[PDB]
CSV table of C-alpha atoms in Angstrom, one decimal:
chain,number,residue,atom,x,y,z
T,1,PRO,CA,0.0,0.0,0.0
T,2,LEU,CA,0.8,3.7,-0.5
T,3,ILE,CA,-0.4,6.7,1.5
T,4,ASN,CA,0.8,10.2,0.4
T,5,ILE,CA,-0.4,13.2,2.5
T,6,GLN,CA,-0.3,16.7,1.2
T,7,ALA,CA,-1.2,19.2,3.9
T,8,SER,CA,-1.5,23.0,4.3
T,9,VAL,CA,-0.3,23.2,7.9
T,10,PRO,CA,3.3,23.8,8.8
T,11,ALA,CA,5.9,21.0,8.9
T,12,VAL,CA,5.8,19.0,12.2
T,13,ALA,CA,8.8,17.8,14.2
T,14,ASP,CA,7.2,14.4,14.8
T,15,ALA,CA,6.5,13.6,11.1
T,16,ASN,CA,8.5,10.3,11.3
T,17,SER,CA,6.6,9.0,14.3
T,18,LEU,CA,3.3,10.1,12.8
T,19,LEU,CA,4.0,8.3,9.6
T,20,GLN,CA,5.3,5.2,11.4
T,21,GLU,CA,2.2,5.0,13.4
T,22,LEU,CA,0.0,5.5,10.3
T,23,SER,CA,2.1,2.8,8.5
T,24,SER,CA,1.5,0.0,11.1
T,25,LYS,CA,-2.2,0.9,11.5
T,26,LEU,CA,-2.7,0.8,7.7
T,27,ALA,CA,-0.9,-2.5,7.4
T,28,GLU,CA,-3.2,-4.1,9.9
T,29,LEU,CA,-6.4,-2.7,8.5
T,30,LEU,CA,-5.5,-3.7,4.9
T,31,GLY,CA,-4.2,-7.1,5.9
T,32,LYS,CA,-0.8,-6.3,4.3
T,33,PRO,CA,2.7,-7.0,5.7
T,34,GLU,CA,4.0,-3.6,6.9
T,35,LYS,CA,7.1,-4.3,4.8
T,36,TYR,CA,5.1,-3.2,1.8
T,37,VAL,CA,3.6,0.0,3.2
T,38,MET,CA,4.9,3.3,1.9
T,39,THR,CA,4.0,6.6,3.4
T,40,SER,CA,4.7,10.3,2.9
T,41,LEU,CA,3.9,13.7,4.5
T,42,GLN,CA,4.4,16.9,2.6
T,43,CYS,CA,3.4,19.9,4.8
T,44,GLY,CA,3.4,23.7,4.1
T,45,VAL,CA,1.6,23.4,0.7
T,46,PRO,CA,-0.6,26.3,-0.3
T,47,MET,CA,-4.1,24.9,-0.5
T,48,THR,CA,-7.7,26.0,-0.4
T,49,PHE,CA,-10.8,24.1,0.5
T,50,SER,CA,-14.3,25.5,0.2
T,51,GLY,CA,-12.7,28.7,-1.0
T,52,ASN,CA,-10.6,29.3,2.1
T,53,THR,CA,-7.1,28.6,3.5
T,54,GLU,CA,-8.0,27.1,6.8
T,55,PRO,CA,-6.1,23.8,7.6
T,56,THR,CA,-6.8,21.3,4.9
T,57,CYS,CA,-5.3,18.0,3.6
T,58,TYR,CA,-5.3,15.9,0.5
T,59,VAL,CA,-4.4,12.2,0.8
T,60,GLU,CA,-3.8,9.6,-1.9
T,61,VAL,CA,-4.2,6.0,-1.0
T,62,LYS,CA,-3.3,3.1,-3.3
T,63,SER,CA,-3.3,-0.6,-2.8
T,64,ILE,CA,-3.1,-3.8,-4.9
T,65,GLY,CA,-6.6,-4.9,-3.9
T,66,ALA,CA,-7.7,-4.8,-0.2
T,67,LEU,CA,-10.2,-2.0,-0.9
T,68,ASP,CA,-13.4,-4.0,-1.2
T,69,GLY,CA,-16.7,-3.4,0.5
T,70,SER,CA,-16.4,-1.2,3.5
T,71,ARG,CA,-12.7,-0.9,3.3
T,72,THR,CA,-12.5,2.6,1.7
T,73,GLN,CA,-14.9,3.8,4.5
T,74,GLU,CA,-12.8,2.2,7.2
T,75,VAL,CA,-9.5,3.5,5.7
T,76,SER,CA,-11.0,7.0,5.6
T,77,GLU,CA,-12.1,6.8,9.2
T,78,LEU,CA,-8.6,5.7,10.2
T,79,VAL,CA,-6.8,8.3,8.1
T,80,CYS,CA,-9.0,11.3,8.8
T,81,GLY,CA,-8.9,10.4,12.5
T,82,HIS,CA,-5.1,10.1,12.5
T,83,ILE,CA,-4.6,13.3,10.7
T,84,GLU,CA,-7.2,15.2,12.9
T,85,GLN,CA,-5.3,14.0,16.0
T,86,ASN,CA,-1.8,14.6,14.8
T,87,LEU,CA,-2.0,17.6,12.4
T,88,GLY,CA,-5.0,19.3,13.9
T,89,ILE,CA,-6.8,19.3,10.5
T,90,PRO,CA,-10.6,18.8,10.9
T,91,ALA,CA,-11.9,15.6,9.2
T,92,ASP,CA,-14.3,17.7,7.2
T,93,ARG,CA,-11.4,19.4,5.5
T,94,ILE,CA,-9.7,16.1,4.5
T,95,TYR,CA,-10.1,14.5,1.0
T,96,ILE,CA,-8.8,11.1,0.1
T,97,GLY,CA,-8.3,9.7,-3.4
T,98,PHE,CA,-8.3,5.9,-3.5
T,99,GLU,CA,-7.0,3.6,-6.3
T,100,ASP,CA,-7.1,-0.2,-6.5
T,101,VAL,CA,-4.0,-0.7,-8.7
T,102,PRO,CA,-3.5,-3.8,-10.8
T,103,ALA,CA,-0.3,-5.6,-9.7
T,104,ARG,CA,1.2,-5.2,-13.2
T,105,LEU,CA,0.8,-1.4,-12.8
T,106,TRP,CA,2.8,-1.4,-9.6
T,107,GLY,CA,6.6,-1.2,-9.9
T,108,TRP,CA,9.0,-2.3,-7.2
T,109,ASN,CA,12.6,-3.5,-7.1
T,110,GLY,CA,13.2,-3.1,-10.9
T,111,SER,CA,10.1,-5.2,-11.9
T,112,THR,CA,6.4,-5.1,-11.0
T,113,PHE,CA,4.1,-7.1,-8.7
T,114,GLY,CA,2.4,-8.7,-11.7
P,1,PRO,CA,-13.4,18.4,-7.2
P,2,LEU,CA,-9.7,18.5,-6.7
P,3,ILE,CA,-7.0,20.4,-8.5
P,4,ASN,CA,-3.3,20.0,-7.5
P,5,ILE,CA,-0.7,22.1,-9.4
P,6,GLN,CA,3.0,21.2,-9.4
P,7,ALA,CA,5.0,24.0,-11.1
P,8,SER,CA,8.7,24.6,-11.9
P,9,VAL,CA,8.5,28.4,-11.4
P,10,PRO,CA,9.4,30.0,-8.1
P,11,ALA,CA,6.7,30.4,-5.3
P,12,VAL,CA,4.4,33.4,-5.8
P,13,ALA,CA,3.2,35.8,-3.1
P,14,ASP,CA,-0.4,35.7,-4.4
P,15,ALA,CA,-0.8,31.8,-4.3
P,16,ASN,CA,-3.9,32.1,-2.0
P,17,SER,CA,-5.7,34.6,-4.3
P,18,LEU,CA,-4.7,32.6,-7.4
P,19,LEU,CA,-6.1,29.4,-5.9
P,20,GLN,CA,-9.2,31.1,-4.6
P,21,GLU,CA,-10.0,32.4,-8.1
P,22,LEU,CA,-9.3,29.0,-9.6
P,23,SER,CA,-11.5,27.4,-7.0
P,24,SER,CA,-14.6,29.5,-7.8
P,25,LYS,CA,-14.1,29.2,-11.6
P,26,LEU,CA,-13.7,25.5,-11.4
P,27,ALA,CA,-16.9,25.1,-9.2
P,28,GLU,CA,-18.9,27.0,-11.7
P,29,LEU,CA,-17.6,25.1,-14.7
P,30,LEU,CA,-18.1,21.7,-13.1
P,31,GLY,CA,-21.5,22.6,-11.6
P,32,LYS,CA,-20.3,21.8,-8.1
P,33,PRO,CA,-20.8,23.7,-4.9
P,34,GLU,CA,-17.5,25.5,-4.2
P,35,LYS,CA,-17.7,24.0,-0.7
P,36,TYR,CA,-16.4,20.8,-2.2
P,37,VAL,CA,-13.5,22.2,-4.3
P,38,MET,CA,-10.0,21.5,-3.1
P,39,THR,CA,-7.0,23.1,-4.6
P,40,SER,CA,-3.2,23.2,-4.2
P,41,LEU,CA,-0.1,24.9,-5.6
P,42,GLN,CA,3.4,23.5,-5.2
P,43,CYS,CA,6.0,25.8,-6.8
P,44,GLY,CA,9.8,25.5,-7.1
P,45,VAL,CA,9.8,21.8,-8.2
P,46,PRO,CA,12.6,20.7,-10.4
P,47,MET,CA,11.0,19.7,-13.7
P,48,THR,CA,11.8,19.2,-17.3
P,49,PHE,CA,9.5,19.2,-20.4
P,50,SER,CA,10.6,18.4,-23.9
P,51,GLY,CA,14.1,17.9,-22.4
P,52,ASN,CA,14.5,21.4,-21.0
P,53,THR,CA,13.9,23.3,-17.7
P,54,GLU,CA,11.9,26.2,-19.1
P,55,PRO,CA,8.8,27.1,-17.0
P,56,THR,CA,6.5,24.1,-16.9
P,57,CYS,CA,3.6,22.7,-15.0
P,58,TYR,CA,1.8,19.4,-14.1
P,59,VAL,CA,-1.8,19.6,-12.9
P,60,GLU,CA,-4.0,16.8,-11.6
P,61,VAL,CA,-7.7,17.3,-11.7
P,62,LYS,CA,-10.2,14.9,-10.1
P,63,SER,CA,-14.0,14.9,-9.8
P,64,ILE,CA,-16.9,12.6,-9.0
P,65,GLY,CA,-18.3,12.8,-12.5
P,66,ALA,CA,-18.8,16.2,-14.2
P,67,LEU,CA,-16.1,15.3,-16.8
P,68,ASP,CA,-18.3,14.2,-19.6
P,69,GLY,CA,-18.3,15.2,-23.3
P,70,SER,CA,-16.4,18.5,-23.8
P,71,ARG,CA,-15.7,19.1,-20.1
P,72,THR,CA,-12.1,17.9,-20.0
P,73,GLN,CA,-11.4,20.3,-23.0
P,74,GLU,CA,-13.2,23.1,-21.2
P,75,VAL,CA,-11.4,22.5,-17.9
P,76,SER,CA,-8.1,22.4,-19.7
P,77,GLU,CA,-8.8,25.7,-21.4
P,78,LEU,CA,-9.7,27.3,-18.0
P,79,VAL,CA,-6.8,25.8,-16.2
P,80,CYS,CA,-4.1,26.4,-18.8
P,81,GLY,CA,-5.4,30.0,-19.2
P,82,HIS,CA,-5.4,30.7,-15.5
P,83,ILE,CA,-1.9,29.3,-15.1
P,84,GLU,CA,-0.5,31.1,-18.2
P,85,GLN,CA,-1.9,34.4,-16.8
P,86,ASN,CA,-0.9,34.0,-13.2
P,87,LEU,CA,2.3,32.0,-13.2
P,88,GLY,CA,3.6,32.9,-16.7
P,89,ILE,CA,3.8,29.3,-17.8
P,90,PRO,CA,3.0,28.9,-21.5
P,91,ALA,CA,-0.1,26.7,-22.1
P,92,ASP,CA,2.1,24.5,-24.4
P,93,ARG,CA,4.2,23.5,-21.4
P,94,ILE,CA,1.2,22.5,-19.2
P,95,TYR,CA,0.0,18.9,-18.7
P,96,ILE,CA,-3.2,18.0,-16.9
P,97,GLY,CA,-4.1,14.5,-15.7
P,98,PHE,CA,-7.8,14.0,-15.3
P,99,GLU,CA,-9.7,11.3,-13.3
P,100,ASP,CA,-13.4,10.7,-12.9
P,101,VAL,CA,-13.4,9.1,-9.5
P,102,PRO,CA,-16.2,6.8,-8.2
P,103,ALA,CA,-17.8,8.3,-5.1
P,104,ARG,CA,-16.9,5.2,-3.0
P,105,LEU,CA,-13.2,5.9,-3.9
P,106,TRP,CA,-13.4,9.5,-2.6
P,107,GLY,CA,-12.9,9.9,1.2
P,108,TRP,CA,-14.1,12.9,3.1
P,109,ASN,CA,-14.9,13.5,6.8
P,110,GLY,CA,-14.1,10.0,8.1
P,111,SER,CA,-16.3,8.3,5.4
P,112,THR,CA,-16.6,8.3,1.6
P,113,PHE,CA,-19.1,10.0,-0.9
P,114,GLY,CA,-20.5,6.5,-1.8
G,1,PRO,CA,4.5,10.6,-20.9
G,2,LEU,CA,4.9,11.9,-17.3
G,3,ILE,CA,7.3,10.8,-14.6
G,4,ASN,CA,7.0,12.4,-11.2
G,5,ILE,CA,9.5,11.4,-8.5
G,6,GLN,CA,9.0,12.0,-4.8
G,7,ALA,CA,12.1,11.0,-2.7
G,8,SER,CA,13.1,11.0,0.9
G,9,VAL,CA,16.8,11.9,0.3
G,10,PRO,CA,18.0,15.5,0.3
G,11,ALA,CA,17.8,17.7,-2.8
G,12,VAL,CA,20.6,17.1,-5.3
G,13,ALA,CA,22.7,19.7,-7.2
G,14,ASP,CA,22.4,17.7,-10.5
G,15,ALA,CA,18.5,17.4,-10.5
G,16,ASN,CA,18.3,19.0,-13.9
G,17,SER,CA,20.9,16.6,-15.5
G,18,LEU,CA,19.3,13.6,-13.8
G,19,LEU,CA,15.9,14.5,-15.1
G,20,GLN,CA,17.1,15.3,-18.6
G,21,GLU,CA,18.8,11.9,-18.8
G,22,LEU,CA,15.7,10.2,-17.5
G,23,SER,CA,13.6,12.1,-20.0
G,24,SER,CA,15.5,10.9,-23.1
G,25,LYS,CA,15.7,7.3,-21.8
G,26,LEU,CA,12.0,7.2,-21.2
G,27,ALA,CA,11.2,8.7,-24.6
G,28,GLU,CA,13.2,6.0,-26.3
G,29,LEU,CA,11.8,3.2,-24.3
G,30,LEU,CA,8.2,4.3,-24.7
G,31,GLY,CA,8.6,5.2,-28.4
G,32,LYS,CA,7.4,8.7,-27.8
G,33,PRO,CA,9.0,12.0,-29.1
G,34,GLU,CA,10.9,13.5,-26.2
G,35,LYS,CA,9.0,16.8,-26.9
G,36,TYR,CA,6.1,15.1,-25.0
G,37,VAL,CA,7.9,13.8,-21.9
G,38,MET,CA,7.4,15.7,-18.7
G,39,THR,CA,9.5,14.9,-15.5
G,40,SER,CA,9.8,16.1,-12.0
G,41,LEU,CA,11.9,15.5,-8.9
G,42,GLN,CA,10.8,16.4,-5.4
G,43,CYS,CA,13.4,15.6,-2.7
G,44,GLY,CA,13.4,16.0,1.0
G,45,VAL,CA,9.9,14.6,1.6
G,46,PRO,CA,9.4,12.8,4.9
G,47,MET,CA,8.6,9.2,4.0
G,48,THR,CA,8.6,5.7,5.5
G,49,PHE,CA,8.8,2.4,3.8
G,50,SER,CA,8.6,-1.0,5.7
G,51,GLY,CA,8.1,1.1,8.8
G,52,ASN,CA,11.5,3.0,8.6
G,53,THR,CA,12.9,6.2,7.3
G,54,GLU,CA,15.8,4.8,5.2
G,55,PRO,CA,16.2,6.3,1.7
G,56,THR,CA,13.0,5.6,-0.2
G,57,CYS,CA,11.2,6.8,-3.3
G,58,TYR,CA,7.7,7.0,-4.9
G,59,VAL,CA,7.4,7.5,-8.6
G,60,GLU,CA,4.3,8.1,-10.7
G,61,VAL,CA,4.4,7.2,-14.4
G,62,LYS,CA,1.7,8.1,-16.9
G,63,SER,CA,1.4,7.6,-20.6
G,64,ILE,CA,-1.2,7.6,-23.3
G,65,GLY,CA,-0.8,4.0,-24.2
G,66,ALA,CA,2.7,2.5,-24.6
G,67,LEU,CA,2.4,0.5,-21.4
G,68,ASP,CA,1.5,-2.9,-23.0
G,69,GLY,CA,3.0,-6.3,-22.3
G,70,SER,CA,6.4,-6.1,-20.8
G,71,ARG,CA,6.6,-2.3,-20.8
G,72,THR,CA,5.7,-1.6,-17.2
G,73,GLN,CA,8.5,-4.1,-16.2
G,74,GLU,CA,10.9,-2.5,-18.6
G,75,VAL,CA,10.1,1.0,-17.4
G,76,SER,CA,10.5,-0.1,-13.8
G,77,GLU,CA,13.9,-1.6,-14.5
G,78,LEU,CA,14.9,1.7,-16.2
G,79,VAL,CA,13.5,4.0,-13.5
G,80,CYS,CA,14.6,2.0,-10.5
G,81,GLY,CA,18.1,1.6,-12.0
G,82,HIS,CA,18.3,5.4,-12.8
G,83,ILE,CA,17.2,6.3,-9.3
G,84,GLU,CA,19.5,3.8,-7.6
G,85,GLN,CA,22.5,5.1,-9.5
G,86,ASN,CA,21.7,8.9,-9.2
G,87,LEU,CA,20.0,9.2,-5.8
G,88,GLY,CA,21.5,6.2,-4.0
G,89,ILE,CA,18.0,4.8,-3.2
G,90,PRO,CA,18.0,1.0,-3.3
G,91,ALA,CA,15.7,-0.4,-5.9
G,92,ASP,CA,13.9,-2.5,-3.2
G,93,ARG,CA,12.8,0.8,-1.6
G,94,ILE,CA,11.3,2.2,-4.8
G,95,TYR,CA,7.6,2.1,-5.7
G,96,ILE,CA,6.1,3.1,-9.1
G,97,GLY,CA,2.4,3.8,-9.8
G,98,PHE,CA,1.6,3.4,-13.5
G,99,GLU,CA,-1.5,4.7,-15.3
G,100,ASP,CA,-2.4,4.3,-19.0
G,101,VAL,CA,-4.4,7.5,-19.5
G,102,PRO,CA,-7.0,7.9,-22.2
G,103,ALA,CA,-6.1,10.8,-24.5
G,104,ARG,CA,-9.3,12.7,-23.7
G,105,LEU,CA,-8.2,12.6,-20.0
G,106,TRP,CA,-4.8,14.2,-20.8
G,107,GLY,CA,-4.9,18.0,-21.0
G,108,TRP,CA,-2.2,20.0,-22.9
G,109,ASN,CA,-2.1,23.5,-24.5
G,110,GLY,CA,-5.6,24.5,-23.5
G,111,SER,CA,-7.2,21.3,-24.9
G,112,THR,CA,-6.7,17.5,-24.6
G,113,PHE,CA,-5.0,14.9,-26.7
G,114,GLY,CA,-8.4,13.3,-27.5
């Protein structure tokens, strides 16, 4: 899995801890070995939401499967909650774009997962 | 809707105004309440286009529907025009990646739009 | 084509050269005129992979076609190799997300390729 966060708030000293905690939580929820979870946090990005510059966040989440049924709701609950708590961005100012990526469209280690 | 801009030119003092103007224009064109429009601008990114480092720009645009028929052309005209005017990046050095995202793949406020 | 690199390692003085070399190599592999290749490199991004902050990299690659059969494997070999050599990021800490984008979903020069 992959989770990339782009946030309007200033950079945080505990970015590494925040991402590591997000990484383990996401592995468990998706039923993936944490070995395969990649995360990022880019703060200080000029953003608007609803026409204003209040704290806001865009997240992209990708996985090879594991996003069936209630999973995208459950991931959103996890991710919005984690970001609310750790970055102080209200959940109603967070967007998440999900993609279930075919394994052959996912490169790793000089090849693909397909 | 979502519009994320990644540009090679230096950061601009009027990023907020630029994004707010883009936000209202995009809401109107897509027929979406501006409440739901998210935007970003990341400048100063090392980029090449056509093998050179002249001013260039990558934009991602996402929407839950509203990208039918001539819409992607019309959005491109709006976006390239806005960026040309405000960042001084020629329209022929702007790329836009569009995605019509299913509502269940769009997280917001601890849940999804599906 | 489009290749956007997001890396955890510090910014490099030779980003332009690195991207230009990647640009020509990618054009040749995909059978696209280099005119149409867009690249970027964003370094210094807080990232984890496998739960740790060792050098790691996320790449997105998009093309209008040209990603059939063995192509995504071949692109991954090229890209992981180039990044390993130039940024010192091990290939086993590199992820690549691929998308074959319909031409009508690819904006350029105030219109789309469709």
